[PDB]
Amino acid sequence: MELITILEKTVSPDRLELEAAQKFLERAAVENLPTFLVELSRVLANPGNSQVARVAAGLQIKNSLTSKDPDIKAQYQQRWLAIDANARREVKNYVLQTLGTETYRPSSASQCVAGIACAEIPVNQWPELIPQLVANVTNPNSTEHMKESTLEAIGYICQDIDPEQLQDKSNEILTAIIQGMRKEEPSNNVKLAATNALLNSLEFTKANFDKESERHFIMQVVCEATQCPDTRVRVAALQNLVKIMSLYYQYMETYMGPALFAITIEAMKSDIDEVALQGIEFWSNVCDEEMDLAIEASEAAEQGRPPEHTSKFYAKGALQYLVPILTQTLTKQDENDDDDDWNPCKAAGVCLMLLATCCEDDIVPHVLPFIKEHIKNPDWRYRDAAVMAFGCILEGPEPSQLKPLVIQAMPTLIELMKDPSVVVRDTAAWTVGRICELLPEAAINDVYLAPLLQCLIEGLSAEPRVASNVCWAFSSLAEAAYEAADVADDQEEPATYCLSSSFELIVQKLLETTDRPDGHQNNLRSSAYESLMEIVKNSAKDCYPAVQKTTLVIMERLQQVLQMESHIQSTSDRIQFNDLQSLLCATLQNVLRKVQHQDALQISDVVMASLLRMFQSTAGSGGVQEDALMAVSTLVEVLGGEFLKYMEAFKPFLGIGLKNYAEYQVCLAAVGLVGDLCRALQSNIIPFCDEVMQLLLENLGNENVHRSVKPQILSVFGDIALAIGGEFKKYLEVVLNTLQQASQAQVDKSDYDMVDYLNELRESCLEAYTGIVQGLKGDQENVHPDVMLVQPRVEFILSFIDHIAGDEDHTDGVVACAAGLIGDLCTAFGKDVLKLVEARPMIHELLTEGRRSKTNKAKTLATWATKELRKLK
Amino acid sequence: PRLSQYKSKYSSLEQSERRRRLLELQKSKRLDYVNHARR
C-alpha cells in the first residue's frame, strides 16, 4: 500500500484497522530504519499531504529518538548516531522545512528537531541547527508559526538535553529566546512560546547571567513580559522570576526593590487565580531559599568561614506586606471543596506557614491581630481564616510566645469543632492536631485532656474532611501523651500514660470509623487504619486489655479478606479488596511489634497461615503487592527460633520475591526479609545464599534498575555471614568490585541530584565487610584464619575509606559504618594496621567528625573505634 | 504543586515512609545484634 494511507489509518477508531497500521509501520522500521525515517520526514515536509499523514509521520520520527524511559531513550539515540550521515542529514533536512509550513496547531517537527538534536548535540553533529533555529526566529520576514514552532523546538531541546551540554550554545540560544520575548513582538503566541523556552534554558544561562549587562538585559525583558496583556505571557514570565530567584539569588539585589517587589506583590492581589498563584508561589519559594541559606549560614559560621551564598532576608523585609494579603486570600474559600484542587486560598495558607517557619517569631505579631478579629467573626469565610491562620503560625516561633496564646485559644478551639460551617470544623480538627503535634505541654493540660478527648470522639463519625483530621488529631495526641509520661521518668512504654484512662473507648471507636460506608472520601478510611497503628505505638503497658482484642479484631478482618482473594473477580475485586488488606499488613506490624512474646505465637501461626495461603493464589496474580513480605519480616523479629514451623513454603515464595528484576521496588523487601532470617535460624541458612548471588547481582544486568537500588544487594551479605559459611570468602572478591566501581564512577556532583545518593553505595559494602570479618572470627579464634588474608585490598579498604572522608560529602550514615569497620577490623589484628591508619591523613578527619555528634549514637562508633587504634605504639 | 504542604499532617501511609521505618528498624536490629559480639 501507500505510506500516506497507512499513516492515515493510524487514527482510525477501528481497533483492528489501527492494529494493522501500527504493524506495517514497525515492519518497514525494522527492514530499514533510515529509508523509513527519510520517507517519513519526506511526508512531514510536504504541505500537500493531509494534516493527519503529517502528524503521524512526525509522531513516528519522534518515537524513534526519545522516550519517557531514560534507558530506552539512551538507546534510541545510539541507534540514531549509528545511522550514516547521508540518511541522517536528509532526515534532519526535511524536519527543518516543516517548521512554519505546518497548520496543526502544535508542531510535530518541533519535537523531532529536539529529538534528533538531543542525539547530535553532545557530539557536535548538527552545526546547522543552532544558527538555523536562531535565524529562523530573528528574521523579520518570519511568519508567526515560523517564530513560534522554532522557539518551541528549542524549548524541548532545553528540557530533554543533558544539562552538561548546552553550555557552548547558551549565548546563541538565549539570543533567539530573548528576541521572541521582546515587547515589540506582535504575536502573543511567539511571546508565550518564547517565554516557555527561557524557563527551560535557565539551566545553562549561568555565564550569561553572570554579566551585569546581559543579566540586566534578561531581567528587563522578563519583567516587561509580566506586563503583557496576554495572561499566558504574564504567568510564563512570573514563573521565570520564581526560577531566577531560586537559582540566581545573588543578583536579585538590583531588581527586588526597584522592580520585582511590586510585580510579585501585585500578582498576589490580581483576582486572576493563575496569576495570583505564581505571586504567592514566588514568595513561598523565597521562604525555602532563605531557609536553606540561613541553615547553610549557621554552618559556615560554625566551620570558620563566610557562606558561599549569603541571604538578604527579603521574606522578612516583605513580611508586613505579604501577611495582610495572604490572610485576606484566606477569605476566598471554595464552597465545593475537592482536596485535589489547588487555589490562591490554599496557596496563601501554605505561604503563611512557610513565612512562619522562615521568619521564626517575626510572624506572630503580624498574624495575631487578624485572628482575634475573626475567630468569632459572624462570617464563615472569615471565621475559618482565623482558625486556619492560627494553625499556620504554630511552627516557627518559640514556645516562649505561643504556648500562652494556644492555651487561651484551646477553649475557643474545642467548641468550634461543632460550628455550623463544615469548613470551620475541618480546619478546626487540623489546627487542634497541629497543636498537640508541636505543643504537647499545652495540649496535655490537666483541664483540657478530657474535654479535648471528648471532642475528637464525636469527630470520628463526622464528614471525612472533618473526620479525617480527627484521626490525625488523635495521633498527635497519643504521640504527645507518650512523651508526657515518658519525660519520664522510666525506660519502658509507661504502664499508664494519660490517655490510658479513656483509651479503651478510642480503640473501640476507631474500628467503626475505619469500617464506615463513606471510607473512600478524603481518605478517611485509610486515615482510620493509620491512626490505629500509630495509637498503638504510643500506648501504655497497662493498655494491654484492648491491644489483645484489637489484635484479634484485626485478624478476624484479615483472615476473612485473604479468602476472597484466592478466587479474585474483576478490578472491583482485585486491588479493590486488597486495599483494606494492605492497610492491615501495616496495623499487624504495629501490634505484633508491641505485644507480649506469648500472644505473638498463636498469632504468628494463624497470621502466617493467612499470608501464605493467600500467597498460593495471589502469585502471580497482580502480586505479590510486597506487603505480606513486610508482615513476615516482623514475625521473625517476634519469633526468632519459632520461624521453624514454616520456612519451607517461604523457600519457593521468598525465592521468587528475590528473582523479580522488573519491579525494582519489590525485591527490596524480600532481601531485608532474608536479613531478618539471619537473626532467626542464625545457624542454618547458608544454602539460601546462592540465590542472591547470580540472581541479584545478575539484576545488575542490564542497568535499567534504579539509582537507589544497590546497597541492600550486598548489605545483606554481612548479616548472612553469621553462620560459619566458608563461601563468603568467594564473594569477597565480588564485594571488592562494587565499592571499587563507585570510585571509578565519575559521578559529577554538580547538582544535588547525584549527591543525594552518591554517598550510599559506600555505606553498603561497609556493612558487608563488618559482617564478613565477624562471622569468620569468634571471640577467641582457634584458627582465625583469613582476616589478614585480605591484606592487599585492605589498602583500598582503608584508602577508599579515606576517600570516603576525602570528598566534602558523605552522610553520617556512611561515617557511622566507616567507623565501625576500622574498629573491629583492627580487632582482626593490629599488624601495622595502625601504621596503615596513620598512613592516610583524612582518616582521622573522619574519625574526629565521627566523634563530633551529630548523629546520636552513630558518633559512639567513631568515638570508641579510637581505643583499639590507641593500643599500639 | 505545594498541595502536599496544605495542612501537612504526619500520616505516613505513602510509598516512602512505609518501607523506610521498617528498613531502618532492621539496620537497628543489625547494629544491635551484629555488634553484640563486636565489643
mmCIF file of N, CA and C in Angstrom, chain A residues 47-128:
data_model
loop_
_atom_site.group_PDB
_atom_site.id
_atom_site.type_symbol
_atom_site.label_atom_id
_atom_site.label_comp_id
_atom_site.label_asym_id
_atom_site.label_seq_id
_atom_site.Cartn_x
_atom_site.Cartn_y
_atom_site.Cartn_z
ATOM 1 N N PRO A 47 3.733 20.012 2.394
ATOM 2 C CA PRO A 47 2.495 20.631 2.880
ATOM 3 C C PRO A 47 1.265 20.161 2.108
ATOM 4 N N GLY A 48 1.466 19.293 1.123
ATOM 5 C CA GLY A 48 0.370 18.786 0.318
ATOM 6 C C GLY A 48 -0.416 17.705 1.031
ATOM 7 N N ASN A 49 0.302 16.763 1.634
ATOM 8 C CA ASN A 49 -0.322 15.673 2.373
ATOM 9 C C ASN A 49 -1.261 16.198 3.453
ATOM 10 N N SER A 50 -2.326 15.450 3.722
ATOM 11 C CA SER A 50 -3.302 15.845 4.729
ATOM 12 C C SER A 50 -2.623 16.134 6.064
ATOM 13 N N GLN A 51 -3.300 16.900 6.912
ATOM 14 C CA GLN A 51 -2.775 17.238 8.229
ATOM 15 C C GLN A 51 -2.523 15.981 9.053
ATOM 16 N N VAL A 52 -3.281 14.928 8.766
ATOM 17 C CA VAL A 52 -3.166 13.675 9.502
ATOM 18 C C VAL A 52 -1.874 12.937 9.161
ATOM 19 N N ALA A 53 -1.661 12.692 7.872
ATOM 20 C CA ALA A 53 -0.496 11.944 7.409
ATOM 21 C C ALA A 53 0.813 12.560 7.888
ATOM 22 N N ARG A 54 0.793 13.863 8.147
ATOM 23 C CA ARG A 54 1.994 14.581 8.559
ATOM 24 C C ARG A 54 2.245 14.449 10.058
ATOM 25 N N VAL A 55 1.172 14.484 10.841
ATOM 26 C CA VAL A 55 1.281 14.335 12.287
ATOM 27 C C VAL A 55 1.693 12.913 12.647
ATOM 28 N N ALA A 56 1.188 11.947 11.887
ATOM 29 C CA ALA A 56 1.542 10.548 12.090
ATOM 30 C C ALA A 56 2.999 10.309 11.711
ATOM 31 N N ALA A 57 3.414 10.892 10.591
ATOM 32 C CA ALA A 57 4.793 10.778 10.134
ATOM 33 C C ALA A 57 5.740 11.422 11.138
ATOM 34 N N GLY A 58 5.292 12.518 11.743
ATOM 35 C CA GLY A 58 6.086 13.217 12.736
ATOM 36 C C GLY A 58 6.120 12.478 14.059
ATOM 37 N N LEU A 59 5.033 11.778 14.368
ATOM 38 C CA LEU A 59 4.936 11.027 15.612
ATOM 39 C C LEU A 59 5.865 9.819 15.581
ATOM 40 N N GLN A 60 5.998 9.212 14.405
ATOM 41 C CA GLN A 60 6.876 8.062 14.229
ATOM 42 C C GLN A 60 8.336 8.452 14.431
ATOM 43 N N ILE A 61 8.760 9.509 13.746
ATOM 44 C CA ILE A 61 10.126 10.005 13.866
ATOM 45 C C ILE A 61 10.461 10.327 15.318
ATOM 46 N N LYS A 62 9.535 11.000 15.994
ATOM 47 C CA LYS A 62 9.711 11.363 17.395
ATOM 48 C C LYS A 62 9.944 10.135 18.272
ATOM 49 N N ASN A 63 9.113 9.114 18.086
ATOM 50 C CA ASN A 63 9.186 7.903 18.897
ATOM 51 C C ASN A 63 10.404 7.034 18.597
ATOM 52 N N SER A 64 11.170 7.415 17.580
ATOM 53 C CA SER A 64 12.336 6.637 17.175
ATOM 54 C C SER A 64 13.629 7.236 17.716
ATOM 55 N N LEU A 65 13.503 8.283 18.524
ATOM 56 C CA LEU A 65 14.669 9.014 19.007
ATOM 57 C C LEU A 65 14.645 9.227 20.517
ATOM 58 N N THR A 66 13.447 9.320 21.085
ATOM 59 C CA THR A 66 13.303 9.604 22.507
ATOM 60 C C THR A 66 12.264 8.701 23.168
ATOM 61 N N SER A 67 12.108 8.855 24.480
ATOM 62 C CA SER A 67 11.159 8.062 25.251
ATOM 63 C C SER A 67 11.064 8.586 26.678
ATOM 64 N N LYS A 68 9.927 8.352 27.327
ATOM 65 C CA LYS A 68 9.768 8.736 28.726
ATOM 66 C C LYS A 68 10.519 7.773 29.642
ATOM 67 N N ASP A 69 11.168 6.785 29.036
ATOM 68 C CA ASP A 69 12.023 5.855 29.762
ATOM 69 C C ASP A 69 13.484 6.179 29.475
ATOM 70 N N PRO A 70 14.221 6.614 30.509
ATOM 71 C CA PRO A 70 15.626 7.021 30.387
ATOM 72 C C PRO A 70 16.472 6.024 29.598
ATOM 73 N N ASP A 71 16.503 4.771 30.040
ATOM 74 C CA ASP A 71 17.309 3.746 29.382
ATOM 75 C C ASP A 71 16.973 3.634 27.897
ATOM 76 N N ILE A 72 15.707 3.359 27.601
ATOM 77 C CA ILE A 72 15.251 3.236 26.221
ATOM 78 C C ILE A 72 15.557 4.499 25.420
ATOM 79 N N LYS A 73 15.448 5.649 26.075
ATOM 80 C CA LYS A 73 15.753 6.927 25.442
ATOM 81 C C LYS A 73 17.231 7.021 25.082
ATOM 82 N N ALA A 74 18.076 6.426 25.918
ATOM 83 C CA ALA A 74 19.517 6.449 25.700
ATOM 84 C C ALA A 74 19.920 5.543 24.540
ATOM 85 N N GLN A 75 19.122 4.507 24.297
ATOM 86 C CA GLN A 75 19.404 3.565 23.218
ATOM 87 C C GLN A 75 18.917 4.092 21.873
ATOM 88 N N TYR A 76 17.716 4.661 21.859
ATOM 89 C CA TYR A 76 17.151 5.214 20.632
ATOM 90 C C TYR A 76 18.048 6.299 20.045
ATOM 91 N N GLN A 77 18.846 6.927 20.900
ATOM 92 C CA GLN A 77 19.789 7.946 20.456
ATOM 93 C C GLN A 77 21.024 7.303 19.833
ATOM 94 N N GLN A 78 21.476 6.203 20.428
ATOM 95 C CA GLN A 78 22.614 5.463 19.897
ATOM 96 C C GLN A 78 22.276 4.830 18.553
ATOM 97 N N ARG A 79 21.015 4.444 18.384
ATOM 98 C CA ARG A 79 20.558 3.891 17.115
ATOM 99 C C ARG A 79 20.575 4.964 16.033
ATOM 100 N N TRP A 80 20.302 6.202 16.431
ATOM 101 C CA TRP A 80 20.319 7.323 15.501
ATOM 102 C C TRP A 80 21.742 7.647 15.062
ATOM 103 N N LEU A 81 22.631 7.835 16.033
ATOM 104 C CA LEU A 81 24.029 8.125 15.741
ATOM 105 C C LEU A 81 24.677 6.986 14.959
ATOM 106 N N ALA A 82 24.102 5.793 15.077
ATOM 107 C CA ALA A 82 24.608 4.627 14.363
ATOM 108 C C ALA A 82 24.356 4.751 12.864
ATOM 109 N N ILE A 83 23.252 5.399 12.506
ATOM 110 C CA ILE A 83 22.902 5.607 11.105
ATOM 111 C C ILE A 83 23.893 6.554 10.435
ATOM 112 N N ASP A 84 24.202 6.284 9.170
ATOM 113 C CA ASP A 84 25.151 7.098 8.418
ATOM 114 C C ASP A 84 24.696 8.551 8.312
ATOM 115 N N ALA A 85 25.582 9.408 7.813
ATOM 116 C CA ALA A 85 25.285 10.828 7.681
ATOM 117 C C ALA A 85 24.327 11.103 6.525
ATOM 118 N N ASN A 86 24.478 10.349 5.440
ATOM 119 C CA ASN A 86 23.618 10.509 4.272
ATOM 120 C C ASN A 86 22.137 10.465 4.625
ATOM 121 N N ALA A 87 21.734 9.417 5.336
ATOM 122 C CA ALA A 87 20.341 9.256 5.732
ATOM 123 C C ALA A 87 19.954 10.253 6.821
ATOM 124 N N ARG A 88 20.882 10.524 7.733
ATOM 125 C CA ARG A 88 20.616 11.445 8.833
ATOM 126 C C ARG A 88 20.406 12.880 8.357
ATOM 127 N N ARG A 89 21.368 13.412 7.611
ATOM 128 C CA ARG A 89 21.247 14.762 7.073
ATOM 129 C C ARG A 89 19.938 14.924 6.316
ATOM 130 N N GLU A 90 19.556 13.923 5.570
ATOM 131 C CA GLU A 90 18.327 14.004 4.844
ATOM 132 C C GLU A 90 17.141 14.100 5.772
ATOM 133 N N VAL A 91 17.134 13.327 6.837
ATOM 134 C CA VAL A 91 16.049 13.419 7.794
ATOM 135 C C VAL A 91 16.065 14.750 8.476
ATOM 136 N N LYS A 92 17.220 15.158 8.957
ATOM 137 C CA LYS A 92 17.388 16.480 9.547
ATOM 138 C C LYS A 92 16.946 17.537 8.547
ATOM 139 N N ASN A 93 17.234 17.325 7.292
ATOM 140 C CA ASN A 93 16.852 18.351 6.370
ATOM 141 C C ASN A 93 15.361 18.570 6.264
ATOM 142 N N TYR A 94 14.587 17.503 6.158
ATOM 143 C CA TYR A 94 13.143 17.592 5.985
ATOM 144 C C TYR A 94 12.411 18.063 7.192
ATOM 145 N N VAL A 95 13.033 17.860 8.319
ATOM 146 C CA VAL A 95 12.492 18.326 9.562
ATOM 147 C C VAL A 95 12.471 19.845 9.627
ATOM 148 N N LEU A 96 13.512 20.461 9.125
ATOM 149 C CA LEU A 96 13.582 21.903 9.095
ATOM 150 C C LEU A 96 12.576 22.552 8.193
ATOM 151 N N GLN A 97 12.320 21.970 7.045
ATOM 152 C CA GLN A 97 11.377 22.581 6.142
ATOM 153 C C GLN A 97 10.048 22.680 6.812
ATOM 154 N N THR A 98 9.654 21.631 7.499
ATOM 155 C CA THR A 98 8.335 21.542 8.103
ATOM 156 C C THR A 98 8.065 22.737 9.008
ATOM 157 N N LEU A 99 9.114 23.254 9.639
ATOM 158 C CA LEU A 99 8.979 24.421 10.506
ATOM 159 C C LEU A 99 8.353 25.599 9.768
ATOM 160 N N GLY A 100 7.184 26.024 10.236
ATOM 161 C CA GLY A 100 6.481 27.140 9.634
ATOM 162 C C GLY A 100 5.492 26.704 8.570
ATOM 163 N N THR A 101 5.751 25.553 7.961
ATOM 164 C CA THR A 101 4.887 25.040 6.906
ATOM 165 C C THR A 101 3.800 24.126 7.461
ATOM 166 N N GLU A 102 3.558 24.220 8.765
ATOM 167 C CA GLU A 102 2.520 23.419 9.405
ATOM 168 C C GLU A 102 1.288 24.251 9.739
ATOM 169 N N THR A 103 0.185 23.566 10.021
ATOM 170 C CA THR A 103 -1.050 24.228 10.422
ATOM 171 C C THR A 103 -1.621 23.540 11.657
ATOM 172 N N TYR A 104 -1.299 22.258 11.808
ATOM 173 C CA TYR A 104 -1.619 21.518 13.022
ATOM 174 C C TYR A 104 -1.084 22.318 14.202
ATOM 175 N N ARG A 105 -1.991 22.915 14.971
ATOM 176 C CA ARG A 105 -1.619 23.897 15.989
ATOM 177 C C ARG A 105 -0.257 23.626 16.637
ATOM 178 N N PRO A 106 -0.118 22.492 17.346
ATOM 179 C CA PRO A 106 1.207 22.149 17.871
ATOM 180 C C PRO A 106 2.085 21.563 16.770
ATOM 181 N N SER A 107 3.344 21.977 16.707
ATOM 182 C CA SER A 107 4.245 21.488 15.671
ATOM 183 C C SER A 107 4.782 20.098 15.997
ATOM 184 N N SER A 108 4.774 19.219 15.000
ATOM 185 C CA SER A 108 5.327 17.880 15.156
ATOM 186 C C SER A 108 6.826 17.902 14.881
ATOM 187 N N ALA A 109 7.235 18.767 13.959
ATOM 188 C CA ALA A 109 8.642 18.920 13.621
ATOM 189 C C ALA A 109 9.442 19.376 14.835
ATOM 190 N N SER A 110 8.829 20.221 15.659
ATOM 191 C CA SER A 110 9.483 20.737 16.855
ATOM 192 C C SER A 110 10.012 19.610 17.736
ATOM 193 N N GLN A 111 9.157 18.633 18.018
ATOM 194 C CA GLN A 111 9.544 17.505 18.856
ATOM 195 C C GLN A 111 10.558 16.617 18.142
ATOM 196 N N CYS A 112 10.553 16.675 16.814
ATOM 197 C CA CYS A 112 11.513 15.927 16.012
ATOM 198 C C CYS A 112 12.872 16.614 16.036
ATOM 199 N N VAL A 113 12.869 17.922 15.791
ATOM 200 C CA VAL A 113 14.091 18.717 15.838
ATOM 201 C C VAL A 113 14.836 18.461 17.140
ATOM 202 N N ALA A 114 14.109 18.529 18.250
ATOM 203 C CA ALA A 114 14.689 18.303 19.567
ATOM 204 C C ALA A 114 15.117 16.851 19.738
ATOM 205 N N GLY A 115 14.276 15.931 19.278
ATOM 206 C CA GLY A 115 14.574 14.514 19.365
ATOM 207 C C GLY A 115 15.905 14.174 18.724
ATOM 208 N N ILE A 116 16.109 14.663 17.505
ATOM 209 C CA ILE A 116 17.360 14.448 16.787
ATOM 210 C C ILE A 116 18.491 15.256 17.412
ATOM 211 N N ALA A 117 18.180 16.486 17.810
ATOM 212 C CA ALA A 117 19.165 17.372 18.419
ATOM 213 C C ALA A 117 19.786 16.743 19.659
ATOM 214 N N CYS A 118 18.939 16.274 20.570
ATOM 215 C CA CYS A 118 19.405 15.665 21.811
ATOM 216 C C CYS A 118 20.365 14.507 21.553
ATOM 217 N N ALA A 119 20.403 14.041 20.309
ATOM 218 C CA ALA A 119 21.274 12.935 19.933
ATOM 219 C C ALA A 119 22.510 13.413 19.176
ATOM 220 N N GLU A 120 22.407 14.578 18.544
ATOM 221 C CA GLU A 120 23.504 15.101 17.733
ATOM 222 C C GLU A 120 24.143 16.361 18.316
ATOM 223 N N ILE A 121 23.663 16.795 19.476
ATOM 224 C CA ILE A 121 24.231 17.964 20.143
ATOM 225 C C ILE A 121 25.478 17.620 20.960
ATOM 226 N N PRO A 122 25.398 16.573 21.798
ATOM 227 C CA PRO A 122 26.546 16.197 22.630
ATOM 228 C C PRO A 122 27.805 15.921 21.814
ATOM 229 N N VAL A 123 27.636 15.407 20.600
ATOM 230 C CA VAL A 123 28.773 15.055 19.757
ATOM 231 C C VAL A 123 28.994 16.064 18.633
ATOM 232 N N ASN A 124 28.392 17.242 18.769
ATOM 233 C CA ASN A 124 28.518 18.295 17.764
ATOM 234 C C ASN A 124 28.392 17.775 16.336
ATOM 235 N N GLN A 125 27.198 17.319 15.972
ATOM 236 C CA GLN A 125 26.976 16.793 14.630
ATOM 237 C C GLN A 125 25.733 17.391 13.974
ATOM 238 N N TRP A 126 25.285 18.528 14.496
ATOM 239 C CA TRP A 126 24.220 19.291 13.855
ATOM 240 C C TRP A 126 24.543 20.782 13.915
ATOM 241 N N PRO A 127 25.624 21.190 13.232
ATOM 242 C CA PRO A 127 26.106 22.575 13.234
ATOM 243 C C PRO A 127 25.069 23.554 12.694
ATOM 244 N N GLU A 128 24.281 23.117 11.716
ATOM 245 C CA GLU A 128 23.268 23.975 11.114
ATOM 246 C C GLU A 128 22.155 24.309 12.101
#
